[PDB]
Amino acid sequence: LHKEPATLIKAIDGDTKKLMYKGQPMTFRLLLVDTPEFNEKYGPEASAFTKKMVENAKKIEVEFDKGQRTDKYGRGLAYIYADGKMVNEALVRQGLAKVAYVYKGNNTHEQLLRKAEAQAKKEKLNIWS
Numbered sequence: 001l002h003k004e005p006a007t008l009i010k011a012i013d014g015d016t017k018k019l020m021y022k023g024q025p026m027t028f029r030l031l032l033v034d035t036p037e038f039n040e041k042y043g044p045e046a047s048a049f050t051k052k053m054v055e056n057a058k059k060i061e062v063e064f065d066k067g068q069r070t071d072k073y074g075r076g077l078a079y080i081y082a083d084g085k086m087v088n089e090a091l092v093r094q095g096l097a098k099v100a101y102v103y104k105g106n107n108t109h110e111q112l113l114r115k116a117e118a119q120a121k122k123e124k125l126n127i128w129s
């Protein structure tokens with residue numbers, strides 16, 4: 001896989017944001033995770049964690065996987081990096097997302113993310129508390 005440039009347009013919630021990619025505005029949905037909706041427990045915390053991570057970053061990058069690049073709602077499906085740290089992994093490691101929506105052939109980082117989830121769970125963090 002490879003990282004490609006993007007810039008933040010606006011934070012939306014724990015697992016979606018609006019980025020400019022190849023010069024076009026798109027909503028991206030993070031691969032292999034599920035944050036709580038804003039109206040659910042830990043939803044505001046997840047939203048704030050993602051927002052801080054992407055707004056504070058000097059460099060946002062998108063990494064598509066091997067399969068589908070857009071979902072049925074037209075959202076980009078990617079791993080999103082902030083100054084080289086993966087947002088997807090960071091949410092999982094903090095107990096603010098569950099590993100989820102693991103579809104065959106867009107699951108390159110599945111094992112990395114499940115390792116993070118195990119650690120968050122051992123620590124009883126947030127969703128696992």
Ligand SMILES: Cc1cn([C@H]2C[C@H](OP(=O)(O)O)[C@@H](COP(=O)(O)O)O2)c(=O)[nH]c1=O
Pocket residue numbers: 029030031032033034071072077101103
């Ligand atoms: C993360 C992801 C979600 N989706 C679709 C599955 C779910 O369909 P349904 O809307 O029919 O439930 C939805 C969940 O996204 P959200 O968690 O953002 O709601 O997005 C994909 O198709 N591919 C993906 O990789």
Ligand SMILES: [Ca+2]
Pocket residue numbers: 015034035036037
């Ligand atoms: Ca969600």
